[PDB]
Write a protein that binds this ligand. Structure first.
Ligand code: NI
Length: 283
């Protein structure tokens, strides 16, 4: 709560040149994800990539807001927006990042696969989301290991002002009976018990960072009190055995996406994919 940079205990500092973590860096990464459920990797992505993705998503926001019903996460101002899947905006260092997949391989296995290429546009004057998990526990009242890791790419500097996400460290292992409602929101009794032992944190995250977290981590989107939309690009790695629909990608990227040992659950389509309406033929 009210930090000035990502906490040391959650953070691993890299450069965009780093292709693998040395054994001790990986051990620390996995120790952080196991204990805290969230890992911040600073210095992962070049300005060249984040700038293009930021531009592409801010250019698409008008088409998203024109929709009959604008799909929002829980409350007003938290808009669901898929980034483009044009050949020229699909970057191996984003989709198939070698450090990300080194971590996800070590936690979920070599057959783990990305099955989400989506985004969260947090609008100026947005409301507070309820504390929730994005992915549920597979059975109520059971402790089990992760089956999915969210990979979140901020496309501007996230600040306390513009809606940097509230995270509940270590919350990813909590699954008592009657803890979650049908939408994945944490029952208030469990929130206040948890707050006494391990209160939530919120911190700036500079663009170029990648956040990897347990899909079961408690978090909430919070108001964007800045004058500008706060874009996030979102991917999710799942174990091979978890049923997900495939990502629609153009067959122009099949050559490097298919037959990588960094797996994507993908359906390849002739021609352009409509990333926003999703309505294209042969989908
Ligand atoms: Ni969420």
């Amino acid at each position: 709560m009210a930090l000035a940079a990502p906490p040391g205990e959650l953070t691993l500092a890299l450069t965009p040149d780093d292709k693998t973590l040395d054994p001790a860096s990986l051990d620390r990464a996995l120790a952080i994800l196991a204990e805290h459920g969230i890992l911040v990797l600073t210095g992962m992505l070049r300005t060249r990539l984040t700038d293009q993705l930021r531009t592409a998503m801010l250019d698409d926001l008008p088409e998203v807001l024109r929709q009959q019903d604008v799909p929002t996460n829980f409350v007003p101002g938290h808009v669901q927006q898929d980034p483009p899947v044009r050949e020229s905006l699909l970057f191996p260092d984003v989709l198939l990042n070698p450090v990300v997949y080194q971590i996800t391989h070590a936690v979920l296995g070599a057959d783990a696969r990305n099955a989400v290429y989506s985004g969260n546009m947090n609008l100026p004057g947005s409301h507070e989301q309820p504390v929730h998990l994005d992915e549920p526990h597979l059975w109520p009242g059971i402790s089990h290991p992760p089956y999915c890791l969210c990979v979140d790419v901020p496309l501007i500097d996230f600040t306390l002002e513009n809606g940097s996400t509230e995270y509940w460290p270590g919350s990813h292992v909590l699954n008592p009976d009657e803890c979650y409602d049908e939408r994945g929101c944490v029952l208030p009794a469990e929130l206040e018990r948890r707050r006494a032992v391990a209160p939530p944190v919120r911190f700036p995250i500079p663009v170029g960072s990648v956040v990897i977290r347990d899909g079961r981590l408690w978090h909430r989107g919070v108001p964007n009190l800045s004058a500008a939309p706060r874009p996030l690009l979102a991917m999710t790695h799942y174990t091979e055995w978890f049923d997900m629909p495939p990502i629609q990608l153009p067959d122009t990227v099949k050559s490097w996406v298919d037959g990588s040992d960094r797996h994507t659950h993908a359906h390849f389509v002739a021609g352009d994919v409509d990333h926003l309406t999703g309505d294209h033929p042969f989908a």
